[PDB]
Copies of this chain bind each other. A is one copy, B any other.
Amino acid sequence: WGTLQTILGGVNKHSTSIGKIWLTVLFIFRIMILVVAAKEVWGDEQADFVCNTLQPGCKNVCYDHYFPISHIRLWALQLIFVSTPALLVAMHVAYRRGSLWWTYTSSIFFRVIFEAAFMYVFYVMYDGFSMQRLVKCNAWPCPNTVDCFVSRPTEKTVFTVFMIAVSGICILLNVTELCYLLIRYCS
């Protein structure tokens, strides 16, 4: 998109001190990582999924059972969910240019909730942050238990720790922006 400078710049103008630091983390360390490096790592997620079996359809059900949602698809959804509250406030500030307190605090509160929900979903669904080389599968029509092997498990572990750590930082930065605002009014 050739208008990225305009929309990012528009958010940049209508932002506080920390809010400008938060924007550089979301765009440079999260959007670019998901676009230039991570999206190609997951290219052959199912094509290079190898199962030690002769059963037709066993590979399809086993990959589906262990990867109900791809990692890169989860991060694409999370990025969009933590992007609407910031832009909606930014558009409202532009329209205003009082009531801004109840929107700016709400957007920060919503972003923290969204970021913690996705991180929780990542942990519970994928039983940790480490991808295993071998998955044992016993769903129909696979006979007994079938051994299957994941494509690039180590590459995916490095990029998932990187994304989780950055999201953890975004939680901390949004907490301080609440602490800065909380002491102004109710303290």
Chain A: residues with CB nearer than 8 A to chain B? 52-55, 136, 143-147
Contacts and interface: CB of A to CB of B under 8 A. Distances in A.
* Total copies of the chain: 2
15 contacts: A52-B53, A52-B54, A52-B55, A52-B143, A53-B53, A53-B54, A54-B54, A136-B144, A143-B146, A143-B147, A144-B144, A144-B145, A144-B146, A144-B147, A145-B145
Contacts of A143: 52, 146-147
A133 to B, nearest CB: 14
Nearest to A137: B144
Nearest to A146: B144
A16 to B, nearest CB: 57
Nearest to A54: B52
A144 to B, nearest CB: 4
A136 B145 CA distance: 12
A147 B53 CA distance: 10
Nearest to A50: B54
Which residue, A136, A144, A147, has most C-beta atoms of chain B within 10 A?
A144
A50 to B, nearest CB: 9
Nearest to A134: B143
A69 to B, nearest CB: 27
A53 B52 CA distance: 7
Given A52-B55, A54-B54, A145-B145, 5 more contacts: A53-B54, A136-B144, A144-B144, A144-B145, A144-B146
Q: Which 5 residue pairs across A and B have the least CB separation, nearest first?
A: A144-B145, A143-B147, A52-B54, A52-B143, A144-B144
A146 B146 CA distance: 9
Contacts of A136: 144
A36 to B, nearest CB: 37
Nearest to A142: B52
